Every structure is written in structure tokens, then in C-alpha cells.
């Protein structure tokens, strides 16, 4: 049997040498060119156990994106463990690109192709690939942006649904576009627009899938975050090099029993880091129109639990490993033996 194994996965991408955009620059020295001739081989009569919650691929990706950010996005000031560091904080061009992960000789990547795959247990339609599909390393909270959609229907995944402390990862089957803009010419005020009916229909379908999981006699409710750091209370993400903090109360105040949803956003200089515990300060926002149009392809939720009859779900996230998990869930690395 080819047992699961840890190896030196290398990265591949379509990064250009003439792009000063930071993902391109990093990939230029860290990655090889995208596989010109990919080969997926189906393994017949093979069943294989996967575990998306215990996957070294996620750990390796996490380290790479950390290195990417730590070389690319330099804050003017950084506070960690009581130690203060200051440096030149030049603004950069910032737009994530797809990164493929590939297995070196002696190893192979197995891929689960089952449509309703929950993340753990046996897979009956397994194939081997030389590289994963292209994954944009988007760092965000609450909403998963520019990821891959579920093929058939919405899928919800958790390491343990009955444990309310475990994050629930939602994978949509239809994207919901969200446009966030800091208009040209209050330099920190911004806003995010999305279709009201599309979001309401999305929450409606997520609730159905949650009822399947927790009980048909349950009343599903969405409420905003209970509190914490700004990065998790709001939908937070980097756009064009600027850190956005978007109030998502309207998105997550819903129960079963306008045209656009407009969320108020703020651009912040002082942020809590995701790479490590500490704070960082960047220079004020750039002038001109700052704008990103993204596909919402997933959500990160937490359940209140405790005591009864009703189940309240709130936007979650925080550990960026779950972001990487939302794309790497169908992969595992094995050694050829």
C-alpha cells in the first residue's frame, strides 16, 4: 500500500518575470512553470481513506503563504512579544494568482472525485495527479473568496459537527459576486455591494443543509459575531494592498420565519497579524479608486450549541489553515512503494 507521507512538495504557477506584483515575484523564484502536460490516472477498484483535517499539504501551504507575505507586505511597525521593529513600508501591487502544488519523484498526489465527499472516510472514485488544481491563496475571514465551487449541491464540512467548538466550512455551488470599493477622492471609508436576493437564496440553501445535519425539527438562525478582534468580527481581507474591514451584520442576521446589500467598510492601518500573534502598522491608503470584485464561494461558520430547540450560527474563521483546507480537502500525498 502507498501510505500517506510527508515530502517536499514544490509549487508551480503561471507567474510572469515582468510582473512586479508580489505574488508573481514570489512565485518567480519559488515555483516552476505550470505543468505543460498534466496526466490524471483513475485508479480502478481502489478505495482510499482521506482526512482533510489532518493533512500535511495544508501545513506546507500555510508556511509558503506566510513566507510570501513576510517578503512582500512590509509594515512600517511590527509588535511581537513586546519587541518592536520598524522599517521602510513601501506600498505594493497585490493580486493573488493560482498556485499548484506538485509531488516530487517517489511520491504521488491522490485525488478524491466523489461529489458529496464530506472530508473524512473512504473515497470510491480515486485518481492520481501530478499537481493540484490552481489555488489562489486568498487571506480572508468569514467569507471564502475566489475559490472552487461544489459541483452538484452545497456541501458543509466539519471535523465534528456535534462539537460546537469546531469550525464549519461551507462550500457553495453558485458564486455570489461581491464588489468592494474605496471610491476615488474620507480616504478610509469604503463599501461592499452584493445582490440581496442571491444572498438570501444562499442563506436559504445553507440552512436546509444544516437542518439535514442537526435535525429537521430544528430552527436555523444566523446571527453576527459575538465579538473579538476586528479581523473576525468583520469580513476582513486585503485588496490592492489595503486591509479592508467590512461590517457583515446584514449578511448574517437571518431566520426562516431592496435590490443590493451595501456593507459599510473601513480601511485600517493597524491590524492583528494572521501569520503570528502580534500587531502591524502600515502607511495610509493610496489615492484613486481601490476596487476588488470577488466570487463568494464559501463561508466559515461556528455554532452556538449548548442549551435548546434552536441552532444559532455565526460567521467564524481566524485560522487561515481552514482557508487552505477548503481547497485542499480532496488531496493527500502518498509514497510510492
Amino acid at each position: 500500500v502507498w501510505k500517506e507521507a510527508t515530502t517536499t512538495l514544490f509549487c508551480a504557477s503561471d507567474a510572469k518575470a515582468y510582473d512586479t506584483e508580489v505574488h508573481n515575484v514570489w512565485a518567480t523564484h519559488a515555483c516552476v512553470p505550470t505543468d505543460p502536460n498534466p496526466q490524471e490516472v483513475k485508479l480502478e477498484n481502489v478505495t482510499e481513506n482521506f482526512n482533510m483535517w489532518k493533512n500535511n499539504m495544508v501545513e506546507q501551504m500555510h508556511e509558503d503563504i506566510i513566507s510570501l507575505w513576510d517578503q512582500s507586505l512590509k509594515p512600517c511597525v511590527k509588535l511581537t512579544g513586546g519587541s518592536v521593529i520598524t522599517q521602510a513600508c513601501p506600498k505594493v501591487s497585490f493580486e493573488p494568482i493560482p498556485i499548484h502544488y506538485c509531488a516530487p519523484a517517489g511520491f504521488a498526489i491522490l485525488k478524491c472525485n466523489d461529489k458529496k465527499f464530506n472530508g473524512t472516510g473512504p473515497c470510491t472514485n480515486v485518481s492520481t495527479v501530478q499537481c493540484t488544481h490552481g489555488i489562489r491563496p486568498v487571506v480572508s475571514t468569514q467569507l471564502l473568496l475566489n475559490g472552487s465551487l461544489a459541483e452538484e449541491e452545497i456541501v458543509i464540512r466539519s471535523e465534528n459537527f456535534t462539537n460546537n467548538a469546531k469550525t464549519i466550512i461551507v462550500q457553495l455551488n453558485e458564486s455570489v459576486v461581491i464588489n468592494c470599493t474605496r471610491p476615488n477622492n474620507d480616504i478610509r471609508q469604503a463599501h461592499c455591494n452584493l445582490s440581496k436576493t442571491q444572498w438570501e437564496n444562499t442563506l436559504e440553501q445553507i440552512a436546509i443543509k444544516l437542518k439535514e445535519q442537526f435535525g429537521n425539527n430544528k430552527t436555523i438562525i444566523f446571527n453576527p459575531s459575538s465579538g473579538g478582534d476586528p479581523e473576525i468580527v468583520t469580513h476582513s481581507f486585503n485588496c490592492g494592498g489595503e486591509f479592508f474591514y467590512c461590517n457583515s451584520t446584514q449578511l448574517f442576521t437571518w431566520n426562516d420565519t431592496g435590490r443590493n446589500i451595501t456593507l459599510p467598510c473601513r480601511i485600517k492601518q493597524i491590524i492583528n497579524m494572521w501569520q503570528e500573534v502580534g500587531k502591524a502598522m502600515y502607511a495610509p491608503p493610496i489615492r484613486g479608486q481601490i476596487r476588488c470584485s470577488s466570487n463568494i464561494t464559501g463561508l466559515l461558520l461556528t455554532r452556538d450549541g449548548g442549551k435548546n430547540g434552536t441552532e444559532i450560527f455565526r460567521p467564524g474563521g481566524g485560522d487561515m489553515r481552514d482557508n487552505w483546507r477548503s481547497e485542499l480537502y480532496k488531496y493527500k500525498v502518498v509514497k510510492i512503494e
Binding site: 465579538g227 473576525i232 485560522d319
Partner: peptide, 27 residues
């Protein structure tokens, strides 16, 4: 995550604190 500044913060909100990665989260 700093769980203690966190719990010390969340308890002032009527809630318990816990780590969400490198961030503070209230429950």
C-alpha cells in the same frame, strides 16, 4: 491568540474568550 488578554477582554463583554488562530474570539 493571547488567550488571556482575550478572556480578559471577552469577560468584559459578558462572554468567554478563546483563540481563533492568532486572533481573539468571544463565545
Amino acid at each position: 491568540x493571547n488567550l488571556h488578554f482575550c478572556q480578559l477582554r471577552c469577560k468584559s463583554l459578558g462572554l468567554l474568550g478563546r483563540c481563533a488562530x492568532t486572533y481573539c474570539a468571544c463565545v
